[PDB]
Amino acid sequence: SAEKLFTPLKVGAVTAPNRVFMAPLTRLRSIEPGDIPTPLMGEYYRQRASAGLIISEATQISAQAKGYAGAPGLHSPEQIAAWKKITAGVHAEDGRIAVQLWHTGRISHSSIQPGGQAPVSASALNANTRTSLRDENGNAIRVDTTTPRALELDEIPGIVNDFRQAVANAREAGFDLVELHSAHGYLLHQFLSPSSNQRTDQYGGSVENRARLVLEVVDAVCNEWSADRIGIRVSPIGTFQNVDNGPNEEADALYLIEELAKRGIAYLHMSETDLAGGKPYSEAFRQKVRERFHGVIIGAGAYTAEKAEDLIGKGLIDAVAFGRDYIANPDLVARLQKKAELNPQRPESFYGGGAEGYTDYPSL
Numbered sequence: 226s227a228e229k230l231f232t233p234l235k236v237g238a239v240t241a242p243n244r245v246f247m248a249p250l251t252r253l254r255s256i257e258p259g260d261i262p263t264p265l266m267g268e269y270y271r272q273r274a275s276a277g278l279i280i281s282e283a284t285q286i287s288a289q290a291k292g293y294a295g296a297p298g299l300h301s302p303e304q305i306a307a308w309k310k311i312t313a314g315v316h317a318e319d320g321r322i323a324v325q326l327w328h329t330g331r332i333s334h335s336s337i338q339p340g341g342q343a344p345v346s347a348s349a350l351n352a353n354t355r356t357s358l359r360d361e362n363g364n365a366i367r368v369d370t371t372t373p374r375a376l377e378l379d380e381i382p383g384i385v386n387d388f389r390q391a392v393a394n395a396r397e398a399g400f401d402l403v404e405l406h407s408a409h410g411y412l413l414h415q416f417l418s419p420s421s422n423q424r425t426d427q428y429g430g431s432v433e434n435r436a437r438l439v440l441e442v443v444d445a446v447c448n449e450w451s452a453d454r455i456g457i458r459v460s461p462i463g464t465f466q467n468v469d470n471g472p473n474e475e476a477d478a479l480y481l482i483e484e485l486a487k488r489g490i491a492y493l494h495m496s497e498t499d500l501a502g503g504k505p506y507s508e509a510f511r512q513k514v515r516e517r518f519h520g521v522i523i524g525a526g527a528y529t530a531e532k533a534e535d536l537i538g539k540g541l542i543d544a545v546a547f548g549r550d551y552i553a554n555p556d557l558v559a560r561l562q563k564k565a566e567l568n569p570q571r572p573e574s575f576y577g578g579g580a581e582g583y584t585d586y587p588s589l
């Protein structure tokens with residue numbers, strides 16, 4: 226039965242009936258051409274509608290934002306129409322869903338960029354990693370990332386407008402909230418990190434300059450819709466996709482959080498460590514974050530129901546986002562509430578493919 230995990234929580238403009246959230250999970254099953262959400266994806270989300278809040282897989286704000294074959298977009302008419310069906314299905318089950326919007330930046334490949342050109346980023350530095358494309362049969366494959374082109378100063382306003390337009394589209398698509406992907410080494414994080422950002426204009430250098438882009442985006446989207454409809458995900462501590470949060474990560478993190486707090490947005494989603502290792506957050510750091518943000522705080526990263534209850538009980542976080550447990554358990558809320566066993570995970574089908582390993586996991 227637990228304690229607080231199953232109690233309501235006001236998240237900006239909506240109210241979650243429990244604090245068990247579904248973390249944003251890239252599954253790469255969209256239709257190409259078009260990067261269009263599918264009926265299968267609709268069923269997948271609908272099966273998980275009992276979550277306090279569903280945060281969708283990362284979705285492109287524009288065609289240029291694309292970095293993975295199979296990832297959906299929210300910039301075209303066909304994409305908007307498809308997502309409207311998915312959010313409607315979730316609402317039909319009385320759930321709530323937020324769309325995570327991103328721009329992959331340098332974690333992309335020229336073959337899936339508009340015109341087949343090099344992807345963009347803060348600086349012209351290859352991420353030295355791989356991304357996922359699809360072969361001639363539609364199967365997911367890994368490929369080395371393409372060296373990016375540094376965005377020109379005059380191109381930044383366009384990036385901000387793309388985020389603004391995507392939120393406008395999200396609103397029409399029926400999403401309850403939007404989550405800006407400012408983590409895991411993607412575009413916004415590429416600007417935030419001193420290791421991936423070597424710009425000498427006002428978007429590089431000091432933390433104030435490095436956080437400039439993300440804050441302009443936050444302001445742009447709050448103005449487009451409403452601050453209580455805006456959430457943001459950050460991974461300010463540690464190293465992700467070869468992007469390292471500088472030698473002053475903690476100080477820089479608190480600066481960013483205080484600035485975000487000023488906009489009165491719906492929530493702050495903290496991805497504590499990537500799938501690989503990572504130093505755990507100290508309660509002291511959690512307290513410092515807590516006192517700087519006045520909205521909902523979501524914790525994520527190998528959480529257990531026990532850890533969630535502990536931190537929620539200490540008043541350090543308000544909700545917990547589960548990723549892999551949600552992939553394998555559509556009715557995770559019921560299972561954690563009943564203290565039931567969970568379905569075993571099948572990692573080989575996390576990315577790409579079809580129904581198997583997707584709408585495949587049974588409910589109690």
Ligand SMILES: Cc1cc2nc3c(=O)[nH]c(=O)nc-3n(C[C@H](O)[C@H](O)[C@H](O)COP(=O)(O)O)c2cc1C
Pocket residue numbers: 248249250251252281282283325406408409458496525526527528546547548549550575576
């Ligand atoms: C298959 C898969 C896809 C993911 N895709 C996303 C995503 O689209 N956006 C994001 O911010 N994080 C993404 N993550 C990270 C998850 O949201 C989550 O924070 C992470 O899996 C750690 O939580 P867990 O231990 O509960 O799975 C992904 C992770 C996995 C396993």
